[PDB]
Amino acid sequence: MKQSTLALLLLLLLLTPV
Amino acid sequence: GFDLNDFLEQLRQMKNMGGXXXXXXXXXXXXXXXXXXXXXXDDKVLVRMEAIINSMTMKERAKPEIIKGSRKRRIAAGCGMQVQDVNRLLKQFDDMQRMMKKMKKGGXXXXXXXXXXXXXXXXXXX
Amino acid sequence: METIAKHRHARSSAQKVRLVADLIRGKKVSQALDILTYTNKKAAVLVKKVLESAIANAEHNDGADIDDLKVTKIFVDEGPSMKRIMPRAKGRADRILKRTSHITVVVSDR
Amino acid sequence: MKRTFQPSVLKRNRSHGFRARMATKNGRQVLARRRAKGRARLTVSK
Amino acid sequence: AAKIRRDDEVIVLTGKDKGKRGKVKNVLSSGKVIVEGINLVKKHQKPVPALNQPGGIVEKEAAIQVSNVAIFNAATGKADRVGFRFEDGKKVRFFKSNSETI
Amino acid sequence: AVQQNKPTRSKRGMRRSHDALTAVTSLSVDKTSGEKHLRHHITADGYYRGRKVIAK
RNA sequence: CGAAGGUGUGCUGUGAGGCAUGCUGGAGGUAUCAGAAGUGCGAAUGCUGACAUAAGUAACGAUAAAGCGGGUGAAAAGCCCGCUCGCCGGAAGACCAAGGGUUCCUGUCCAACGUUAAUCGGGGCAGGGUGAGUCGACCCCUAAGGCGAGGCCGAAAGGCG
RNA sequence: CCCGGCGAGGGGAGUGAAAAAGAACCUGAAACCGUGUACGUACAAGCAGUGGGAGCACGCUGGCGUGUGACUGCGUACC
RNA sequence: UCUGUUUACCAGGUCAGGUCCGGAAGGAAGCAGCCAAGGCAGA
Ligand SMILES: [Mg+2]
Ligand SMILES: [Mg+2]
Ligand SMILES: [Mg+2]
Ligand SMILES: [Mg+2]
Ligand SMILES: [Mg+2]
Ligand SMILES: [Mg+2]
Ligand SMILES: [Mg+2]
Ligand SMILES: [Mg+2]
Ligand SMILES: [Mg+2]
Ligand SMILES: [Mg+2]
Ligand SMILES: [Mg+2]
Ligand SMILES: [Mg+2]
Ligand SMILES: [Mg+2]
Ligand SMILES: [Mg+2]
Ligand SMILES: [Mg+2]
Ligand SMILES: [Mg+2]
Ligand SMILES: [Mg+2]
Ligand SMILES: [Mg+2]
Ligand SMILES: [Mg+2]
Ligand SMILES: [Mg+2]
Ligand SMILES: [Mg+2]
Ligand SMILES: [Mg+2]
Ligand SMILES: [Mg+2]
Ligand SMILES: [Mg+2]
Ligand SMILES: [Mg+2]
Ligand SMILES: [Mg+2]
Ligand SMILES: [Mg+2]
Ligand SMILES: [Mg+2]
Ligand SMILES: [Mg+2]
Ligand SMILES: [Mg+2]
Ligand SMILES: [Mg+2]
Ligand SMILES: [Mg+2]
Ligand SMILES: [Mg+2]
Ligand SMILES: [Mg+2]
Ligand SMILES: [Mg+2]
Ligand SMILES: [Mg+2]
Ligand SMILES: [Mg+2]
Ligand SMILES: [Mg+2]
Ligand SMILES: [Mg+2]
Ligand SMILES: [Mg+2]
Ligand SMILES: [Mg+2]
Ligand SMILES: [Mg+2]
Ligand SMILES: [Mg+2]
Ligand SMILES: [Mg+2]
Ligand SMILES: [Mg+2]
Ligand SMILES: [Mg+2]
Ligand SMILES: [Mg+2]
Ligand SMILES: [Mg+2]
Ligand SMILES: [Mg+2]
Ligand SMILES: [Mg+2]
Ligand SMILES: [Mg+2]
Ligand SMILES: [Mg+2]
Ligand SMILES: [Mg+2]
Ligand SMILES: [Mg+2]
Ligand SMILES: [Mg+2]
Ligand SMILES: [Mg+2]
Ligand SMILES: [Mg+2]
Ligand SMILES: [Mg+2]
Ligand SMILES: [Mg+2]
């Protein structure tokens, strides 16, 4: 849902550029 | 709250589905600013993450701030890796504590929309 | 073996910090840590920090057992002091000195 | 109490503004001296 | 009128590399050159996640003053000094000792 | 009134001779938990004289 | 194989001085006899910078006033939330003009700034924010007053109109 | 790498001839502030030194230097 | 001596995950979880 897409998206991704 | 228990289960539920070619194509705004090939090695790094979070005693996970020099020697020895990698894994966990406490305070839309992509001057990449 | 930990440019005067520094001189660092815990001063928490750091240094770098450590030399020097201005009555003004200090703690197994 | 500087823009500019200087011989001498000392701004303008 | 150029093989006169030979990567405006296998420095690099740059100590090549490198004569096996003449109508470089063109 | 001559570091030392703090001698050790603490003051865990009288 | 300078120490001259040398320093110094002097400092209520002293003293800006629970957090008398208490109310409220010029709102940070701490701010850094035929300015019209073609006047500049 | 607040600052490690060259960065003087050691000081009157001088400490090879200076003679800054 | 629960690495055994050696066969040091075990208790 919304908290699973806000979990996974910025988890995988915002672990990428940082 | 948010611990390395929920981070353990976050990353072990995310080491089933996690991939870098399926999740660098599910966002159009973050793969054009930072490079599209800086994503991750998902299986290597998530099996690393799960390894390192297996090296912990359970109150070292539920209370991540008591992890010190001896604790990181013991964790880095447990899974066969470097103390620096465990350093950067507890770093990553710290960033995600930041983000999910921010998602706790601010409404889901005002903390997902005010999210910023950042460069050091307007010229591309420097 | 001697080990250093320093904190440089701390806000407090040398003078105020000296009061506390001179409480812990000579004790073994356990007993001294407690002396510092229940001292009510600002300098106390500054110096507590520096002392603890010093212990970490000794153990991690030089492989000293914590039990044996004493505080052999602890001294507070003057730091760079910054001028400010407080306006005073009838127009005259006052160059203010916001003082800082160098807390230097050194521990040894001997 | 009531101090000496009570600012006004229209006042400021009619008194010291560029055009006000340029009006006269003396003023253009001011603007001469300034241009010779090489100021950042000659007059008071916004 | 520039004596030392890209891709010339040179020999190093001065420094820790004295006597070593190598190939020029590029030149810089300040009169500095950067030579293959020459003047390695060990540089510390803070890991950068955007460029996927790991950390660590990278051995890199640091610029050397162009006065310190001589154009290597392959014929004589000696360092040489260079000069200019006009062959055809074109401006060309030659070695001072055997006066042969490059 | 304001001083007539610059008082030497000597005098300045003397005046400060009394200004030294007193290190607290005793650290009472609570029976149940065993942590050190002040006489008559509760511990960091809220223990006093063997009770846990604060839940905190 | 270590110059000038810094710091010691030893020796020597009637004196200003000189020589030698341990540490520091890391590249300039200079015999001899002459030459030229911005040539020697403790004072000038001397000039600049630095550091003292009184002294951890006076003071912390209205005598309208605070108390508790919870939250955040390294740390909460001061921040957010709730609850009672108290002060202003022809103002200590609300809207403008002037004047200021981003101080507005959000996120984030706590060195300096805030007369204490500060997690807070009118502080730092990044972003956003000001939507007009009918509200103002502009514009149309003139007041006092200004400038003023010709003109009158004045050594020149200029004054009056 | 470690302490700390994902601080300040520090300590190791590494570069370098050198990091008492670390950006608060050549040289780093004095005032001024300290920590350590020797000596003296809690019955003692004064421009604080000079003359005499016991003891103690440290260097030397029972004497000679060095620091200190109990006790007493004389002794009211400079411009 | 049963049961309740406590003790990160630096007593023991199992030692998942992960990691070293090997092409492979397999071994191995051992983090966590569990059980001894040591704290403290109901008897
Ligand atoms: Mg005033
Ligand atoms: Mg007088
Ligand atoms: Mg006092
Ligand atoms: Mg030398
Ligand atoms: Mg010399
Ligand atoms: Mg000279
Ligand atoms: Mg000299
Ligand atoms: Mg010298
Ligand atoms: Mg040197
Ligand atoms: Mg040297
Ligand atoms: Mg000379
Ligand atoms: Mg002469
Ligand atoms: Mg002169
Ligand atoms: Mg002078
Ligand atoms: Mg004189
Ligand atoms: Mg005066
Ligand atoms: Mg200056
Ligand atoms: Mg003063
Ligand atoms: Mg003082
Ligand atoms: Mg007083
Ligand atoms: Mg008083
Ligand atoms: Mg007063
Ligand atoms: Mg007072
Ligand atoms: Mg006030
Ligand atoms: Mg609270
Ligand atoms: Mg409260
Ligand atoms: Mg208050
Ligand atoms: Mg409230
Ligand atoms: Mg009224
Ligand atoms: Mg007005
Ligand atoms: Mg305005
Ligand atoms: Mg601003
Ligand atoms: Mg605001
Ligand atoms: Mg804000
Ligand atoms: Mg403050
Ligand atoms: Mg406070
Ligand atoms: Mg603070
Ligand atoms: Mg602001
Ligand atoms: Mg209108
Ligand atoms: Mg008119
Ligand atoms: Mg005319
Ligand atoms: Mg006129
Ligand atoms: Mg740091
Ligand atoms: Mg080296
Ligand atoms: Mg300095
Ligand atoms: Mg140099
Ligand atoms: Mg220096
Ligand atoms: Mg010095
Ligand atoms: Mg000095
Ligand atoms: Mg008597
Ligand atoms: Mg006596
Ligand atoms: Mg007396
Ligand atoms: Mg004598
Ligand atoms: Mg001796
Ligand atoms: Mg003798
Ligand atoms: Mg003697
Ligand atoms: Mg005498
Ligand atoms: Mg006399
Ligand atoms: Mg007398």
Q: Is beta strand E69-72 parallel, antiparallel or unpaired with respect to E9-12? A: antiparallel
Q: How many separate domains does chain D show?
A: 1
Full domain range(s) for residue C5: 1-110
Residue B77, nucleotide of least CA–C1' distance: I31
From the CA atom positions of chain F, what is the Rg in Å? 22
Backbone angles phi and psi of B114, in degrees to 5: -65, -5
What's CA C78's distance to the chain center, in Å?
11
From the CA atom positions of chain E, what is the Rg in Å? 17
Q: How many separate domains does chain E show?
A: 1
- For E41, other C-beta atoms within 10 Å of its C-beta total 10
Instruction: For residue B17, say whether its CB is under 7 Å from any atom of strand I.
Output: no
Q: Which of E51, E53, E57 to mutate to test the interface with B (most CBs of B within 10 A)?
A: E51
Q: How many separate domains does chain C show?
A: 1
Full domain range(s) for residue D32: 1-46
CATH number at residue D26: 1.10.287.3980
- Give the residues across from C96 on adjacent strands: C84
Helix/strand/coil for E65: strand
Report the distance separating Cα A18 and Cα A14, nearest Å: 6
How would you write chain B as a 3-class SS string? CCCHHHHHHHHHHHHHHCCHHHHCCCCCCHHHHCCHHHCCCHHHHHHHHHHHHHCCCHHHHCCHHHCCHHHHHHHHHHCCCCHHHHHHHHHHHHHHHHHHHHHHHCCHHHHHHCCCCCCCCCCCCC
Resolution (A): 3.8
N- to C-terminal Cα separation, chain F:
56
Is the domain spanning B1-126 CATH 1.10.3720.10? The answer is no
Segment 1-18 of chain A within 8 Å of chain B by CB: 2-3, 6-18
**CB spacing of B40 vs A15 below 8 angstroms:** yes
| A18, closest residue in chain E (CA to CA) | E49
Chain E residues close to A17, C-beta within 8 Å: 49-50
Report the distance separating Cα C85 and Cα C89, nearest Å: 13
Which helix or strand (DSSP H or E) is residue E88 part of?
none
CATH number at residue C26: 3.90.470.10
Beta strands in chain E (DSSP E): 9-12, 21-27, 32-35, 40-44, 57-61, 64-65, 69-72, 79-80, 82-87, 90-95
